[PDB]
Amino acid sequence: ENITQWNLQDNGTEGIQRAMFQRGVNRSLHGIWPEKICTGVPSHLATDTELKAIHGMMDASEKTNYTCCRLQRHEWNKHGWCNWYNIEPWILLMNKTQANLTEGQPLRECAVTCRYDRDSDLNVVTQARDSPTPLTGCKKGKNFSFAGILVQGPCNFEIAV
Ligand SMILES: *[C@@H]1O[C@H](CO)[C@@H](O[C@@H]2O[C@H](CO)[C@@H](O[C@@H]3O[C@H](CO[C@@H]4O[C@H](CO)[C@@H](O)[C@H](O)[C@@H]4O)[C@@H](O)[C@H](O[C@H]4O[C@H](CO)[C@@H](O)[C@H](O)[C@@H]4O)[C@@H]3O)[C@H](O)[C@H]2NC(C)=O)[C@H](O)[C@H]1NC(C)=O
Ligand SMILES: *[C@@H]1O[C@H](CO)[C@@H](O[C@@H]2O[C@H](CO)[C@@H](O[C@@H]3O[C@H](CO[C@@H]4O[C@H](CO)[C@@H](O)[C@H](O)[C@@H]4O)[C@@H](O)[C@H](O[C@H]4O[C@H](CO)[C@@H](O)[C@H](O)[C@@H]4O)[C@@H]3O)[C@H](O)[C@H]2NC(C)=O)[C@H](O)[C@H]1NC(C)=O
Ligand SMILES: *[C@@H]1O[C@H](CO)[C@@H](O[C@@H]2O[C@H](CO)[C@@H](O)[C@H](O)[C@H]2NC(C)=O)[C@H](O)[C@H]1NC(C)=O
Ligand SMILES: *[C@@H]1O[C@H](CO)[C@@H](O[C@@H]2O[C@H](CO)[C@@H](O)[C@H](O)[C@H]2NC(C)=O)[C@H](O)[C@H]1NC(C)=O
Ligand SMILES: O=c1ccn([C@@H]2O[C@H](COP(=O)(O)O)[C@@H](O)[C@H]2O)c(=O)[nH]1
Numbered sequence: 001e002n003i004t005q006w007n008l009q010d011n012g013t014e015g016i017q018r019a020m021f022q023r024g025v026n027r028s029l030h031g032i033w034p035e036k037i038c039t040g041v042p043s044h045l046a047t048d049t050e051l052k053a054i055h056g057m058m059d060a061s062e063k064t065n066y067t068c069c070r071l072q073r074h075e076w077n078k079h080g081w082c083n084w085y086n087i088e089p090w091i092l093l094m095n096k097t098q099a100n101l102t103e104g105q106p107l108r109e110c111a112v113t114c115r116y117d118r119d120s121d122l123n124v125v126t127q128a129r130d131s132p133t134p135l136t137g138c139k140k141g142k143n144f145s146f147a148g149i150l151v152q153g154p155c156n157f158e159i160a161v
């Protein structure tokens with residue numbers, strides 16, 4: 001099964017999370033990851049015109065001012081081509097995932113990486129995914145802030161349940 005992961009806004013974290021805060025973006029798709037990682041010559045080189053059709057996904061690179069298409073192309077190259085075989089169904093899934101993320105807090109949202117904010121005493125979530133996973137930078141016993149939404153645990157749904 002595919003892991004869907006995304007970035008969340010945080011002015012306290014340099015890079016994409018800061019660029020997101022400035023542009024009023026809450027969630028920005030990082031990738032959709034099957035188990036197979038692509039290696040070798042891609043079956044199609046992704047174009048800027050193709051990658052821009054993933055609406056609302058922000059590049060993690062400062063060089064494009066956090067727009068398009070360094071991260072988008074990296075994702076196609078490392079996780080896309082050998083798994084989707086054709087760019088069209090891949091762009092459509094990526095664009096639809098971002099459209100869903102743009103609507104707000106997803107049904108399943110689990111913290112991946114945090115920046116613990118001493119001032120607010122919160123785990124400000126900087127990256128999240130649709131399934132639970134071991135945490136990075138999340139302070140034990142502290143509540144979680146997912147682009148402004150306060151959650152008591154790492155997920156917004158019970159994982160025992
Ligand atoms: C979003 O997040 C960013 C990053 O943390 C915040 O930006 C910081 O804001 C503070 C407060 O305005 C800045 O502090 C001031 O730094 C001055 C020196 O800055 C240097 O220059 C580079 C730019 O080339 C900075 O990026 C570096 O940080 C350098 O250190 C410093 O001179 C200044 O002091 C003066 O003001 C204070 C009061 O604010 C006085 O008490 C003091 O005596 C003196 O007069 C500040 O300390 C900080 O530099 C900014 N950081 C960055 C990386 O940009 C934003 O505030 C956050 N935005 C929101 C909306 O919350
Ligand atoms: C989770 O991630 C996996 C990838 O690991 C996704 O599965 C891929 O889904 C895409 C569709 O979104 C599939 O692409 C289509 O593949 C057709 C050929 O596939 C054959 O069948 C098996 C799978 O049962 C493959 O493994 C073989 O290699 C076979 O070749 C292909 O013909 C088709 O292209 C046609 O349509 C497109 C437009 O839709 C045209 O552009 C094109 O010219 C052509 O007419 C698609 O490329 C892909 O096969 C799937 N890969 C695997 C390994 O299963 C899941 O969908 C993801 N699921 C979720 C929920 O995220
Ligand atoms: C975007 O969100 C919609 C709505 O939650 C998802 O659509 C659901 O898909 C499942 C099957 O995967 C259906 O059983 C539901 O009926 C659908 N709901 C609606 C309201 O259409 C969709 O899968 C999401 N897309 C992606 C790519 O994440
Ligand atoms: C980004 O997320 C924040 C936090 O959930 C959203 O802000 C909420 O917006 C509603 C309606 O505007 C207010 O009633 C709430 O008080 C807000 N919550 C907080 C904590 O500020 C914001 O709307 C989202 N932005 C986008 C573009 O979807
Ligand atoms: O979508 C992204 C890509 C990168 N990073 C951050 O930027 C760091 C390094 O930049 P790079 O190795 O991707 O070039 C990553 O380890 C992570 O801390 C993100 O938060 N989101």
Ligand SMILES: O=c1ccn([C@@H]2O[C@H](COP(=O)(O)O)[C@@H](O)[C@H]2O)c(=O)[nH]1
Nearest residue numbers: 003005030031033034035074075078079
């Ligand atoms: O299945 C995956 C793929 C990637 N990552 C993490 O996401 C970041 C970038 O993945 P990538 O999209 O560049 O491959 C890396 O820190 C990597 O550890 C995962 O946790 N699981």
Ligand SMILES: *[C@@H]1O[C@H](CO)[C@@H](O)[C@H](O)[C@H]1NC(C)=O
Nearest residue numbers: 053055056092095096098099
């Ligand atoms: C991409 O998603 C947007 C919503 O963010 C939607 O308006 C558009 O139709 C989608 N593009 C497609 C389906 O090619």
